[model samples]
Target chain A: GPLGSGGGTIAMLNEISSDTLEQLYSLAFNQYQSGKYEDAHKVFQALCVLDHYDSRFFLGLGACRQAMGQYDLAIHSYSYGAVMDIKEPRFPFHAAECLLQKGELAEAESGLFLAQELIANKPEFKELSTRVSSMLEAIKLKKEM
Target chain B: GGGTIAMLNEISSDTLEQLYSLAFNQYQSGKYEDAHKVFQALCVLDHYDSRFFLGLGACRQAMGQYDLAIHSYSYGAVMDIKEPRFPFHAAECLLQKGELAEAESGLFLAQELIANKPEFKELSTRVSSMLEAI
Candidate 1:
């Protein structure tokens, strides 16, 4: 098919060699920045295979899956991230956000509260905590209305 | 993969019970934030049930999410047809939010519904006085 030429060109220009895990990580990070979540998921999935126990890979994969609207899978990936690095607040934060999107506010709020407590001292995380708090308030108000 | 396998193998029943027990314990402890989380998990498990929504409303009320508390209570009322307590809770939420007139209407509805209930008889006078004051 002549249409395959365009795909080939794009692949040649953007493709990172699959041999190096760092290259896959960089590609996934770049795809995420460009909002190409599907591509990011594939790259991150590859990265996960190379580093099966890495929390960051699972976290990034979860975020990409969330962007792709694969909420259930995103939840599972985020859960993995949470298990690996219980102290890194963003894993639970994103997991909670996915739960909220699924209308699981109770679970979302729980995870958000846990993230808030774990990262209270970090400025960026504290800001996220305030945002999540406001979101919880908003969710409560909306449910009532 | 190990993490995925481990999580996949985790028992579902224990998690469900843990989440429920944790929510109830947190509510009893007056830790509204924690209780809200526990209830949220329960709601996720069964959004159609009025009891879950009612508990969620109570938790929100404790957290000063007054409007949200009212909304949750209304949902429970509509689903379960237990009009009295729902509207009363709504009125309480409205009162906290400074909507006295709306609160009065809510209380009026509650009084009407609970007029025949023996347990609510003692609160009838209080509702009447509150309505009069408003």
Candidate 2:
């Protein structure tokens, strides 16, 4: 396992300056938040290639793909993010959303369950639990449907 | 940019052991708050070890911070599934917090995980007693 179990699959580390990466991340995140999925996707993709060790890059890449209705690609990106940071709930949470979009209810539920478990008993992640519960409820009703 | 740190080449197991010893000394001395700080630092440096979070949870439990202890134990349990002590300790904290349902669940989980492991016979009995009390 990589140091701290950090970074997605192990590879040679990037030598880019942290400041440059930070600037690029800010730009990518801004574009993502602004609903510019195409632009955000390009930058996020670049970030992912530049630093596979940073889970946030994959997370942003996944979010861009999800927003663009590229569920399969989003799931792929989210899976890398999940591997990069095993304990982070966002990767599984968003991956579940992509699965839900793809009509994979059982898979979505499994992902959400893991995400919920990761956040369980974590006060700092209380809000995330609420969202996970809401998603689970929605899945339950969908199963009934 | 932080490839060296990311690779964890700067720290050695010897150094980690020494730090853990220092943290344990603080814990044994009843300096729970100090132990908690050191244990937290150790956790940030190495996420793969169950011992770091276990120490963190122990310190918080001693300090009466049951919630934080439960979080650490829960995370450690997920990180190292074979370590039944995580759930067992978390159950102890939950029991102290008067959360019988969650506590019962945790104990049962711990009991299940410890099954067939003769080394944990005492732990099995302790879990059984906790279940009986509930």
Candidate 3:
């Protein structure tokens, strides 16, 4: 996997300055947007270690893990983000999606429902309402399948 | 979008049955909640059918709602259908509820009803064990 191949590169990047970490974060974000999930995952992993407890970096790492079909790891990363920032509904949503992919329907439904409910009541998450609603509908249909 | 709207407008009983079949398939694959939701929707649309009740009961059983499943199967029995499968399901539910004596009787009744049924002959060992256990 990317983790295996990128270990040496990650070790090499660890000695760089905080400015390099920021640059790497931006580059990883750009790679993610361009659908280079493997590259994004390696860069995000480096940033996560450097930042130590940055929830956004963990969230991006989770998304990259999901893109690589490592659902359990993705769920773990998202859950870490959720713990670090309880107010961020996106972490739970991403974790629920990973659970869904793993066929843990009941857990997925519970997580997704919590995510939807949290996103609904928070004004800062207004932009995510429609996305959450769509996810809810999809999970609802999956439940009814 | 045109195809999507057209498809949405094409809903019917058959489409619902297809959905139920899909749910049943998932249930057989151990996706209990998925099956339960689909069967619940089907029961809402048509509560008169014994098979639908049976499917719903199975879903309830999968979800560990033993008493609710018994109620569902009882509704099927009251519909005047004396199917051995219904009795067996009742026995299973009874066993789940810890009503050993009643469950034994239900299993015996199921065995009797299915004596001549080729399909149910395979259930003989299961019925025998349930009866002996009680």
Candidate 4:
């Protein structure tokens, strides 16, 4: 806990400057990209406290948690960041991954459905849409067993 | 490129003002979602603008994204660390979510943040009352 948490992972202190969060975002994500999930996780976690609205911070934070095998915390981070106003599909998609890992098929299915709806109209989300469809199919079959 | 008191964080002050005014207008018109989307894009374009995040929080709060609304305000408050209004709104979001304790924290911070700003005169009084009632 680099910055410490308040009630429910309460964020860091006030008024970060411009480009700082983005620059921090780059470093945090660059760490994740380099497989330095531990270091990446710390920066992302701090950013989550400093700036909560950006889905990028939570998404990156969740990725680090997932990489560290902290599946449940990953799920919490993802779900917390899944609010519709952020309007991104990846948050729910990744959360669904954690749920599926936990064997929560029904919840994962719902998460997939929500993810699909968010990016259904975007052409760039085609790859994700395909994976989501495949996951939905896999879930359907799993439930039949 | 600025007059007397133009904001400093914008790359394209013109574009920033355009979007900011448009989103502000939409919020004024009670189109929270529409306003939020515009503000969201603006935030990406100018992440330091507290006003954009503030607008983002307002619209999200209006649209019932209470937790996200709180985040938006938190982002804004930190970026413009001196504004009580941002945390004040965050407290309201927490209150909406029934997190009385967390909301109380936000309200108290708001009270402190706005304490000496004469511009927030009426707003400060209201925030004090808000904390008292809670």
**Overall lDDT per candidate, in order of appearance:** 0.72, 0.79, 0.73, 0.75
Interface RMSD of 2: 15.9
Q: What tens digits encode model 3's per-residue C-alpha lDDT throughout A1-145?
A: 2213255533432233344345446768998999999878766764565565789889999999999999999998899898899878889888888897888878877887778778776788777777777877887897789
Ranking by TM-score: 4, 2, 1, 3
Per-residue lDDT of model 3, residues B1-134, tens digit only: 42322133333455456556766786899866556555654554455656677887897777676776888788787774668778899899888888888898888788887787778767877888878877
TM-score winner between 2 and 3, please give it. Answer: 2
Put down candidate 2 lDDT per residue, B14-124, tens digits, no spaces. 556656786798899987655665565567557677998999889778867677788888899888998899989999999999999999998889988998987998998
Q: Which stretches of candidate 4 lie over 4 Å from their true place?
A: A1-15, A84-86, B1-134
Tens digit of per-residue lDDT, candidate 1, span A15-123: 2223224444675799899998876776576456445688889989999999988899999999988888999888888988899889897898888788878877787
Worst 10 residues of 4 chain A by lDDT: A8-17
Give every collision pair in model 1: A106-B40, A107-B40, A107-B41, A140-B68, A144-B71
B21: Cα error in model 4, Å: 41
For residue A130, what is the lDDT in candidate 1?
Answer: 86
Proportion of the native interface contacts kept in model 2: 0.00
In what order do the candidates fall by lDDT, top score first? 2, 4, 3, 1
Q: Scoring each candidate complex against the real one, what DockQ results?
A: 0.01, 0.01, 0.01, 0.02
Point out the higher-scoring one by lDDT: 2 or 4. 2
Q: For residues B68-109, could you state the per-residue lDDT of candidate 4 as single tens digits?
A: 778787678767888888878888888888888988898888
On residues A1-145, what C-alpha lDDT tens digit does candidate 2 reach at each position?
Answer: 1112224211111123343356557868998999999877766775675567899999998999999899999999999998989999999999999998788999999999999989989999999899999999998998899
Model 1, B92-119: lDDT tens per residue?
Answer: 8898889999998889888878877888
Please tell me what DockQ candidate 2 reaches: 0.01
